[PDB]
Design an enzyme around this catalytic site. Structure first.
Site, mmCIF file in Angstrom:
data_model
loop_
_atom_site.group_PDB
_atom_site.id
_atom_site.type_symbol
_atom_site.label_atom_id
_atom_site.label_comp_id
_atom_site.label_asym_id
_atom_site.label_seq_id
_atom_site.Cartn_x
_atom_site.Cartn_y
_atom_site.Cartn_z
ATOM 1 N N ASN A 81 41.504 2.265 76.597
ATOM 2 C CA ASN A 81 42.618 3.123 77.057
ATOM 3 C C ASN A 81 42.216 3.533 78.456
ATOM 4 O OD1 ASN A 81 44.392 3.438 74.728
ATOM 5 N ND2 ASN A 81 42.515 4.114 73.716
ATOM 6 N N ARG B 132 55.759 -0.881 76.206
ATOM 7 C CA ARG B 132 56.056 -0.228 74.945
ATOM 8 C C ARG B 132 56.148 1.258 75.047
ATOM 9 N NH1 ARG B 132 50.359 -1.627 73.963
ATOM 10 N NH2 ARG B 132 49.796 0.239 72.820
ATOM 11 N N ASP C 216 45.121 -0.738 77.583
ATOM 12 C CA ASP C 216 46.403 -0.022 77.664
ATOM 13 C C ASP C 216 46.355 0.950 78.826
ATOM 14 O OD1 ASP C 216 47.876 -1.159 75.530
ATOM 15 O OD2 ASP C 216 47.300 0.395 74.091
ATOM 16 N N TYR D 199 37.870 -3.035 74.361
ATOM 17 C CA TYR D 199 39.061 -2.195 74.251
ATOM 18 C C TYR D 199 38.946 -1.056 75.236
ATOM 19 C CZ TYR D 199 42.259 1.230 71.960
ATOM 20 O OH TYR D 199 43.217 2.158 71.623
ATOM 21 N N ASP E 257 54.652 4.203 72.305
ATOM 22 C CA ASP E 257 53.996 4.558 71.049
ATOM 23 C C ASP E 257 54.237 6.023 70.825
ATOM 24 O OD1 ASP E 257 52.974 1.953 71.392
ATOM 25 O OD2 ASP E 257 50.903 2.480 71.097
HETATM 26 C C1 HPN Z 1 42.875 8.345 73.524
HETATM 27 C C2 HPN Z 1 44.379 8.452 73.349
HETATM 28 C C3 HPN Z 1 45.079 7.126 73.531
HETATM 29 C C4 HPN Z 1 45.760 6.659 72.286
HETATM 30 C C5 HPN Z 1 46.911 5.702 72.561
HETATM 31 C C6 HPN Z 1 46.864 4.832 71.341
HETATM 32 C C7 HPN Z 1 48.055 3.968 71.380
HETATM 33 N N1 HPN Z 1 47.893 2.754 71.717
HETATM 34 O O1 HPN Z 1 49.203 4.365 71.060
#
Ligand code: HPN
Ligand code: HPN
Lengths: 146, 145
Positions: free
Chosen positions: A52, A96, A129, A50, A98
């Site tokens: 970010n 998306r 992401d 995973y 969020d």
């Molecule tokens: C470290 C902050 C990132 C959080 C984004 C989480 C999300 N996917 O909405």
């Protein structure tokens, strides 16, 4: 709360899950609002990752779980809207927004994200992401690199 | 550009499998021209472009003007597309672009996930998602102005 962008596709299939893997990814998107790392980790294979993308990756299911547990200590995912979903070669892509609410400050931000998911036998083997971290941090008054 | 742990080593990974994917990979090749006039030929009149940390450009002229500005301050020296896929009129690219800031001479390898919408072989939307601050810090230029 989340508004529809001017660039949204007019093809209904672009906004709907059109494969079994895409369906799982949308179920996972719905689950994010639980803010529950133990619930969410069930979607993951043991050998997984995973990231970010503004921040370092987590490799292996335990590291992933520990990251999510930390995330949900500082923020709530209040809503998720996926405008576009598609897939090829074992990768699902989601465009998306969020809605993120910082628990220390009460402030929220609508974060635009493009993400990629790799599923093996219906379990997540990779999730990355992509988004801008600084605008989010500035909006919610929390320095999110530490 | 070196290969991420997570990037597919499959012989087909970042190879086009559709007409639209083919056009997008030609476009990626063309980015290193740093030539807004060349690049704008890929776009429809009703189009948009956005580097998602920054405001969007709507319409072909605004897109061209944005690109011309971009290429005044930086060079795209290399592009590598690790993954490409598509569905329902949208193409997605997971890539790294090597960017060099002309004012400072410093470069950065920028991790990007981008989406492209095509209508009749022309770009009606292009949105690239990435973190701006890390790039700015690496190249010593404030990229929000
Ligand atoms: C470290 C902050 C990132 C959080 C984004 C989480 C999300 N996917 O909405
Ligand atoms: C505002 C800087 C963004 C430039 C990114 C260009 C690219 N796609 O490599």
């Amino acid at each position: 709360k989340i508004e529809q962008p001017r660039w949204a596709s007019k093809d209904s299939a672009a906004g709907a899950a059109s494969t079994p893997d895409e369906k799982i990814v949308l179920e996972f998107m719905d689950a994010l609002t639980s803010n529950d790392a133990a619930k969410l980790i069930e979607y993951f294979a043991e050998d997984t990752m995973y990231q970010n993308m503004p921040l370092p990756p987590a490799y292996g299911r335990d590291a992933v779980e520990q990251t999510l547990a930390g995330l949900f200590t500082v923020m709530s995912i209040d809503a998720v809207e996926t405008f576009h979903i598609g897939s090829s070669n074992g990768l699902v892509y989601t465009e998306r927004v969020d809605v993120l609410r910082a628990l220390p400050t009460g402030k929220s931000y609508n974060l635009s994200i493009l993400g990629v998911f790799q599923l093996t036998e219906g379990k997540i083997t990779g999730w990355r992401d992509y988004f801008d971290l600084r605008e989010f941090e500035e909006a919610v008054d929390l320095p999110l690199r530490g």
